[PDB]
Amino acid sequence: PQITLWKRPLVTIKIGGQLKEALLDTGADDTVIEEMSLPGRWKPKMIGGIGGFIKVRQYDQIIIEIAGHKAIGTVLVGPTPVNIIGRNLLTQIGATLNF
Amino acid sequence: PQITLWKRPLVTIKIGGQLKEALLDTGADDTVIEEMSLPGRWKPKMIGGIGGFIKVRQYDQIIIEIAGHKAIGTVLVGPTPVNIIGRNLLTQIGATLNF
Ligand SMILES: CC(C)CN(C[C@@H](O)[C@H](Cc1ccccc1)NC(=O)O[C@H]1CO[C@H]2OCC[C@H]21)S(=O)(=O)c1ccc2c(c1)OCO2
Ligand SMILES: [Cl-]
Ligand SMILES: [Cl-]
Numbered sequence: 001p002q003i004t005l006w007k008r009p010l011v012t013i014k015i016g017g018q019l020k021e022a023l024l025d026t027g028a029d030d031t032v033i034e035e036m037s038l039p040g041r042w043k044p045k046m047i048g049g050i051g052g053f054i055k056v057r058q059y060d061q062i063i064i065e066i067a068g069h070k071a072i073g074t075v076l077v078g079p080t081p082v083n084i085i086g087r088n089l090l091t092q093i094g095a096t097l098n099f
Numbered sequence: 100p101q102i103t104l105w106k107r108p109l110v111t112i113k114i115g116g117q118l119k120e121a122l123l124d125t126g127a128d129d130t131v132i133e134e135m136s137l138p139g140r141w142k143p144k145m146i147g148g149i150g151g152f153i154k155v156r157q158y159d160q161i162i163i164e165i166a167g168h169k170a171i172g173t174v175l176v177g178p179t180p181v182n183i184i185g186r187n188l189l190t191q192i193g194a195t196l197n198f
């Protein structure tokens with residue numbers, strides 16, 4: 001699709017069999033999701049946003065559907081205010097910015 | 100242009116007679132620029148992101164040139180770690196997300 005930006009570019013994602021809402025976010029290097037259970041081991045990561053840095057749990061090679069497109073990649077889990085799909089998965093679904 | 104998302108979608112902007120680098124950010128409702136002077140009236144605002152909130156100055160009806168495209172809108176000025184072009188101005192240059 002071609003998504004305009006008059007409203008938040010919210011899509012449905014599927015992770016762990018559950019549907020969630022998430023923001024397509026070209027200003028996010030990484031994908032960050034609210035607290036949830038994911039399988040496997042995790043590694044520590046600190047990410048820096050507008051208000052400062054937070055600690056998150058990094059899960060690699062997680063299967064996630066984004067707006068009907070399949071991706072498998074790194075998902076960070078932590079106290080983000082909204083679920084954000086960052087460039088690491090936007091590139092896997094073939095997203096570009098166009099003007 | 101068509102901008103891929105392998106790297107940060109940074110562009111050059113002109114604001115307040117100054118050239119700056121800024122992030123084209125579909126996850127940002129608002130445009131947020133590092134501390135600078137702008138003419139006219141402003142009012143305080145709090146905006147929140149990962150890490151929490153920062154206090155900003157809200158300037159309305161500011162003209163910005165974004166990758167050579169002129170837009171006018173509200174610009175928030177404050178201690179953002181990155182200059183961000185948010186949806187309020189991305190719409191005006193006709194930016195879309197495509198996949
Ligand atoms: C988190 C989302 C919902 C909002 N943010 C825009 C993001 O694109 C933000 C923009 C951002 C970019 C860099 C530094 C700080 C903020 N990115 C971000 O936090 O990404 C984090 C996850 O991946 C990492 O790579 C980027 C930082 C990490 S934001 O910067 O907090 C923001 C911008 C304008 C706003 C606003 C919040 O509220 C109202 O207007
Ligand atoms: Cl830790
Ligand atoms: Cl505006």
Ligand code: NA
Nearest residue numbers: 139140159160
């Ligand atoms: Na003004």
